[PDB]
Amino acid sequence: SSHKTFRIKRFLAKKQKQNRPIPQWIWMKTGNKIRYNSKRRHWRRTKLGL
Amino acid sequence: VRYSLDPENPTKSCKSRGSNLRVHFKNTRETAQAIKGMHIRKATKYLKDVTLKKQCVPFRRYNGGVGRCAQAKQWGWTQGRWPKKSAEFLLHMLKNAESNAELKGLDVDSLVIEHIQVNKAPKMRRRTYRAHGRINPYMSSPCHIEMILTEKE
Amino acid sequence: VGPVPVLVMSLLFIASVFMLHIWGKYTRS
Amino acid sequence: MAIKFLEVIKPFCVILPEIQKPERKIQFKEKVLWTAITLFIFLVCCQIPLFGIMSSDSADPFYWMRVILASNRGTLMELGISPIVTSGLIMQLLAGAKIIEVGDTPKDRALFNGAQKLFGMIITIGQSIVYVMTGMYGDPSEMGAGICLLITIQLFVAGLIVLLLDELLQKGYGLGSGISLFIATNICETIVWKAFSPTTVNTGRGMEFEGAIIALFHLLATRTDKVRALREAFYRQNLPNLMNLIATIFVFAVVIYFQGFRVDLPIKSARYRGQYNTYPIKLFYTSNIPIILQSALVSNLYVISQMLSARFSGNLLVSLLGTWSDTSSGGPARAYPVGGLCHYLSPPESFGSVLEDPVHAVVYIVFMLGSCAFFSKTWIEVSGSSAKDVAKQLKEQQMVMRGHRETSMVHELNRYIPTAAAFGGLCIGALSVLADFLGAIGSGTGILLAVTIIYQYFEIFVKEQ
Amino acid sequence: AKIKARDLRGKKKEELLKQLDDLKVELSQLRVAKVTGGAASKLSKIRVVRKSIARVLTVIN
Amino acid sequence: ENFLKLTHVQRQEAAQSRREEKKRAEKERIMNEEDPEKQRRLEEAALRREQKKLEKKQMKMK
Amino acid sequence: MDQVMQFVEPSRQFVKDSIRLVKRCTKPDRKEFQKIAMATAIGFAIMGFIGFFVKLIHIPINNIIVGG
Amino acid sequence: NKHQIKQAVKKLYDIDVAKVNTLIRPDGEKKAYVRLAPDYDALDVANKIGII
Ligand SMILES: [Mg+2]
Ligand SMILES: [Mg+2]
Ligand SMILES: [Mg+2]
Ligand SMILES: [Mg+2]
Ligand SMILES: [Mg+2]
């Protein structure tokens, strides 16, 4: 809702900052396999638990 | 790339190709069998008449439910349609083959489309919603294409 | 005008000025 | 309901020779080769003497001016770049003032360029005729009509060749701008020549090498009083001094240090995350152009004043514009303006002259600073280098400032660019005045022009590379 | 200048806290340069100054 | 095929020459367009097309 | 005094803005200054050398052309 | 707190403060709008500290 708590606003903030693509400088590394970000989340389909 | 049929004379023969073309494979196979032996002015004119519904495309192998039209009595067939997306894909590809026969220095007004084949590309997957909470596949049937024209005077 | 023609005209003008100097010296002498 | 000025000039434009732009992008090495060839031709023209000049030891009124204009007296480059600079200044000022409305259409732009070229050629013809008629090469009656016509034709052809070479370089056959390259090369040549010239000039006491370094070595080798000879080389009254060379080097370093001052604005690609670039707003944002415009205007004023004094002696307007006297004070004849506006505009030769005439020095300093600031402000508006235009370029390049819309970028740029322009122009004028007072070889204006032109050329070279 | 922990052990508690109170201001000015946009020569000095503060507080404790 | 490879340079040069000629004709038509509004629209489309070509070249290289 | 204030205020604003510009200007690092100075020196040397040689070569030619 | 903020801008920048209004962003950090005394000019203390 709009009557969040602090622990929840902070958990949503973390779940917002984990929701960004891999940095472009990161697959010229040597021991690399990550083609893309697979841990992404869409607000419509998956509902963050809680 | 590795085509299926190699031309009998590379200098007076031009190539073209298409990969993962979001068309229908059955429609493209039929509008390719209609074009299979024409001359490239006959072809561009035909495909334009097909887009304007002045001529049709006889549906011979994939003709389930495909209704009967009057413009198919030139091909001795009864069923036919007017695939527009598939008369425009192998028209932008006939344009590519034109611009490759000018890059090869051929006579565009003497080119006969000699080899033309359509294959089946990897299906793309979506999902529909049916009764009783069931989900079904809604897959797409794309196609590969590859043609070879040739000067034949 | 092409760049090569511009260069040729400049060189011809320089040569003409040298020729004019030579002719002036011959006329004075 | 004004008939278009460009339309009036359009029939004349057809006669004008225009260099065809290259159909193919020229290779960088080829561009370097074209620039070298054009520079070599320019230097050869700078060294070739005009035909038929009668050898007159007449005062050079414009000696300071020639270095700035890349002009050598008695050579095909006597006019130098002055007509081209004057025509550019006039045409740009007219466009900025909106007296001539230039349409965005290519026909209008082509007409504008053709008109500027035609005006440059007309100015070249007028100046060449004026110089011949003023007796700078000898009395016109003594030279004869044929020689005067030949000299005028030669000057016209040399100016046309210079204009074509500049067009060739600007159109992308070569590197940078031909006018800038010519000015920089002429200043560098003059400074190197004064430093290392092996020519001997007969001062009344003795034959003295013109080149400061060569004279220093010769004096040190030939004189028993090595310390006295070194002091004489440092403080020679009549020839370029080692102290003057040191002053020039100090000025050169100071100018480079000021040139390096910039304000970096952080710009990010909107398309690509994490791409940080800086937009450098230089302290000398408007470049040497304010100096070039000021010097061209002053040069035209001096030429007009000298002509008016020569033809209409004793008129009050002529005296107000300038009175010229040829001071052969133990030196090659130099015509100095001793009264009038030209006198106030002329730089004082030394701190001693500044002490003698403090009002003149103050007026000159104020005029130089004010003119440089005014020209810089006007130039930004005329050039399309205003904060709005820079923001438009950034938008075209898809570069966006972090957290700021393109309009915000315009506001931020508008905060800095006018201040940067005006302060840079003031600093440039102050540096020029300081170098002139220090007596730097090649002039304070010349040293500033050379340093900034070289820096811009180097930036162009690095960017292309 | 490379701040080594060796030449930090002889100095006095307040001759250390003045270095701390100067390095923290250099941090604040670098975390400001980071947000205003600054040269990488400066940005890379953050890892050097956070560790200089770490060395100082380590010798202090 | 070997002969065509040997002749490969000439075909590229000819294609470049014909693209040039085509660009020259397009430029001439734009110059020759009497109506200033039409000329500006054609010019803006041509310039935007060039900009799109430059962006596309950058994107392909990228 | 109104005319004096009218002249003083734009100049005072300009001075304040100039101070702001100078304060935000990045001063060149010693390495950057050395690189710029070296590049400028190379360009100056090349142009001056070419001009000096061209002038020296032309001087005998000019003496022959004009002297005689 | 708004008290620690007030008494720490009056230490890092030596500028008396009119009021402080904090808010925690969805990012997680605590934005704070500090309003300077009437005579003190924000634009001219941001000119000083760098942001301008
Ligand atoms: Mg069947
Ligand atoms: Mg059925
Ligand atoms: Mg049915
Ligand atoms: Mg359903
Ligand atoms: Mg359900």
Measured between beta carbons, which residues in chain B are less than 8 angstroms from residue F8?
none
What is the number of H-type helices and E-type strands within chain D? Answer: 19, 7
G49 to chain D, any CB pair closer than 8 A? The answer is: yes
Tell me the sheet residues that pair with D337.
Answer: D324
Phi, psi of D326 (to 5 degrees): -90, 105
Q: Which amino acid type is present at position D99?
A: I
Measured between beta carbons, which residues in chain H are less than 8 angstroms from residue G23?
47-48
Domain ranges of chain G: 6-66
H50 to chain A, any CB pair closer than 8 A? The answer is: no
Q: Is A21 exposed, middle or buried (0-12, 13-18, 19+ CB in 10 A)?
A: exposed
> Does the residue D10 lie in any domain?
no
Interface of G with D in 24-43 (CB under 8 A): 24-28, 32-33, 36-37, 39-40, 43
Terminus-to-terminus CA distance in chain F, angstroms? 32
- Provide the experimental method for this PDB entry: cryo-EM
CB contact under 8 A, D164 and C6: yes
Q: Give the integer Cα–Cα distance in Å for D423 and G61.
A: 48
CB atoms within 10 A of CB D412: 16
CB contact under 8 A, D273 and A24: yes
The CATH number linked to D363 is 1.10.3370.10
Distance from CA of C17 to the nearest CA of D (A): 7
Q: Give the integer Cα–Cα distance in Å for D303 and D342.
A: 10
Inspect the structure and tell me whether chains D and C have 3 or more CB pairs less than 8 Å apart. Answer: yes
**The total number of structural domains that make up chain D:** 1
Structural tokens at position D124: 């070249």
> Does the residue D17 lie in any domain?
no
**Integer CA distances (angstroms), D394 to D31, D275, D316, D382, in order:** 27, 14, 54, 19
The SS3 of residue D186 is helix
Structural tokens at position D46: 């700078």
Question: What letter would DSSP give residue B153?
Answer: -
Angle between helices D178-196 and D28-47 (to 10 degrees): 60
Q: Which amino acid type is present at position D217?
A: F
Inspect the structure and tell me whether chains D and E have 3 or more CB pairs less than 8 Å apart. Answer: yes
B82 CA from centroid of ligand 4 (Å)? 29
Inter-residue contact D125 to D87 (CB < 8 Å): no
CB contact under 8 A, A25 and D274: yes
Query: CB under 8 Å to E55, separation ≥6 — which residues?
Result: E3, E4, E5, E8
D271 to chain A, any CB pair closer than 8 A? The answer is: no
Inter-residue contact D70 to D182 (CB < 8 Å): yes
B127 CA from centroid of ligand 4 (Å)? 10
Inter-residue contact H9 to H34 (CB < 8 Å): yes
Which contacts of D279-284 are long-range, i.e. CB under 8 A and separated by 24 or more positions? Answer: D279/D390, D279/D394, D279/D399, D281/D413, D281/D416, D281/D417, D281/D420, D282/D420, D282/D424, D283/D258, D283/D259, D283/D420, D283/D423, D283/D424, D283/D427, D283/G21, D283/G25, D284/D258, D284/D259, D284/D424, D284/D427, D284/D428, D284/D452
Name the closest residue on chain C to residue D165, using Cα atoms. Answer: C6
Structural tokens at position A18: 């984990």
Looking up tokens 């003409």, which residue turns up?
C16
F15 to chain B, any CB pair closer than 8 A? The answer is: yes
Q: Give the integer Cα–Cα distance in Å for D423 and D432.
A: 14
Q: Which chains touch D (3 or more CB pairs under 8 A)?
A: A, C, E, F, G
Structural tokens at position D117: 């070229």
- Choose, out of H22, H23, H24, H31, the residue to mutate when testing the contact with A (most A CBs < 10 Å): H24
Name the closest residue on chain G to residue D192, using Cα atoms. Answer: G48
Element (H, E) at B129: strand B127-129
Pairing of strands H30-36, H17-24: antiparallel
**Integer CA distances (angstroms), D125 to B152, D128, D135, in order:** 67, 5, 16
Question: Which of F20, F31, F40 is facing D23, going by the closest CB pair?
Answer: F20
CB atoms within 10 A of CB G41: 14
Inter-residue contact D385 to D263 (CB < 8 Å): no
> Does the residue D6 lie in any domain?
no
Q: Which chains touch F (3 or more CB pairs under 8 A)?
A: B, D
- Choose, out of H44, H47, H49, the residue to mutate when testing the contact with G (most G CBs < 10 Å): H47
B59 CA from centroid of ligand 1 (Å)? 9
CB contact under 8 A, E29 and H50: yes
Name the closest residue on chain D to residue A20, using Cα atoms. Answer: D273
Q: Is D139 exposed, middle or buried (0-12, 13-18, 19+ CB in 10 A)?
A: exposed
Q: Give the integer Cα–Cα distance in Å for D322 and D201.
A: 32
> Does the residue D11 lie in any domain?
no
D147 CA from centroid of ligand 1 (Å)? 101
D188 to chain G, any CB pair closer than 8 A? The answer is: yes
> What is the radius of gyration, based on Cα positions, of chain C?
13
H49 to chain E, any CB pair closer than 8 A? The answer is: yes
Tell me the sheet residues that pair with H23.
Answer: H31
Which contacts of A16-19 are long-range, i.e. CB under 8 A and separated by 24 or more positions? Answer: A16/H26, A16/H27, A17/H27, A17/H28
CB contact under 8 A, G40 and D40: no
Query: CB under 8 Å to E45, separation ≥6 — which residues?
Result: E30
CA dihedral H34, H35, H36, H42 (to 10 degrees): 80
Q: Give the integer Cα–Cα distance in Å for D62 and D60.
A: 5
Structural tokens at position F18: 């014909």
Inter-residue contact D439 to D247 (CB < 8 Å): yes
- Choose, out of G21, G27, G46, the residue to mutate when testing the contact with D (most D CBs < 10 Å): G21
Angle between helices D406-438 and D444-464 (to 10 degrees): 140
> Does the residue D199 lie in any domain?
yes
Measured between beta carbons, which residues in chain E are less than 8 angstroms from residue D266?
36-37
Looking up tokens 């013809």, which residue turns up?
D125
Q: Which chains touch B (3 or more CB pairs under 8 A)?
A: F
B69 CA from centroid of ligand 3 (Å)? 16
Pairing of strands D200-202, D207-209: antiparallel
CB contact under 8 A, G68 and C25: yes
H12 to chain E, any CB pair closer than 8 A? The answer is: yes
Distance from CA of A3 to the nearest CA of H (A): 14
| Full 3-state SS string of D368-400 | HHHHHHHHHHHHHHHHCCCHHHHHHHHHHCCEE
Q: Which chains touch H (3 or more CB pairs under 8 A)?
A: A, E, G
Angle at A21 between CA A15 and CA A24, to 5 degrees: 145
Name the closest residue on chain D to residue F51, using Cα atoms. Answer: D396
Element (H, E) at H22: strand H17-24
What's the reported resolution, in angstroms, to a tenth? 3.9
> Does the residue D12 lie in any domain?
no
Angle between helices D145-168 and D178-196 (to 10 degrees): 110
G24 to chain H, any CB pair closer than 8 A? The answer is: yes
Distance from CA of H32 to the nearest CA of A (A): 17
Q: Give the integer Cα–Cα distance in Å for F53 and B36.
A: 35
The SS3 of residue D70 is coil
Q: Which amino acid type is present at position G40?
A: T
Looking up tokens 């060449």, which residue turns up?
D128
Name the closest residue on chain G to residue H43, using Cα atoms. Answer: G20
Element (H, E) at B114: strand B111-120
Q: Which amino acid type is present at position D229?
A: A
